[PDB]
Design a protein around this ligand. Sequence first.
Ligand SMILES: O=P(O)(O)O[C@@H]1O[C@H](CO)[C@@H](O)[C@H](O)[C@H]1O
Length: 391
Amino acid sequence: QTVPEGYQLQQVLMMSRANLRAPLANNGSVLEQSTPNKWPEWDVPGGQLTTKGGVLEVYMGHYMREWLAEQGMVKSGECPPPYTVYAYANSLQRTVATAQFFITGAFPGCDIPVHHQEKMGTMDPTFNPVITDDSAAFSEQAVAAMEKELSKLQLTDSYQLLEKIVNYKDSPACKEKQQCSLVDGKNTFSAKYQQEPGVSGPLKVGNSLVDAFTLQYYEGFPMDQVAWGEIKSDQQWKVLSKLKNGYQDSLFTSPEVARNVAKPLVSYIDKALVTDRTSAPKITVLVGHDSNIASLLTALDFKPYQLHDQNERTPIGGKIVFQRWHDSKANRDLMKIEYVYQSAEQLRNADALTLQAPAQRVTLELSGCPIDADGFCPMDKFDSVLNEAVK
Ligand SMILES: O=P(O)(O)O[C@@H]1O[C@H](CO)[C@@H](O)[C@H](O)[C@H]1O
């Protein structure tokens, strides 16, 4: 796609998801349980981003810069006035790190800080995808809603395949804990107040391992290191990644769970973009997590989508960039949202990102903001979406 003539970009807001990180330490014991195999090592601890993650984000920031300059939002090689860019990430190493690389990459040698709560290592409610309603009746409505969501999915082939690549029957889950079937395993969904919706069972092991295999791919481990050369071969990946996208769908894609869990980001966006656009900076960078993008996208009732050359519905370094454009001809404003990310090969190979060889881009759409032939939506309808979403 290519923006039409007569349109001038006015404001940008990116919802980013941190780049290449090591598998979550939080899932450390479920990976040991799920197989008799040895797990490759990482030089970074728990779930911190890797040096490659930073390198990949630098490219992402350089591409974003070239695009922003090309669109008149900034100039190339000169750096913008004091408060042009505003970067905010939550207090996790992972998210703050990717913001530093992104910014240093987009505006090298400038003086654009990265904001975050003073308390680091802990979560910032803004980005914390937790249940903020202790209605009790709500935690029950949530669990059920999740369960129903899982029912729409079909991961039987994913599990069977997973069982084999993982040699799960020889794992200390089948031997010792009698859990010997991912496909028949019972799933129990949680939703305790002030915490992330969870899953205990085959769906967790599924998402945990596949996430580890997926990260291993990107980090560039040789093929015999990514799932021990097992997950290799064709698109067993397409079916294995369903456990990973199905996990996300059940915990954050539910309508009533999304609306709650996302409450703070919707509120944020609906303020920097609507109620307080006059005070907001031309450019904003929110670095969050896939949970945030999953619940955010749902809460604002987005139309389904599909990312080309990507197996994850929320790409490791992908960013949802909201764009307010002003149509010179007809004195009106317009919203154009797009998912800007790096394909899997772009991540695995670490390709220099430039306008010559751009990052992947898919234009999204809001149910309440029908998109036109060029992918634009009137700022009127969008406004109503966010102002309605916050209610
Ligand atoms: O987007 P990342 O941080 O890489 O991964 C996500 O992070 C979420 C917390 O923000 C957590 O709840 C999800 O399980 C995890 O997949």
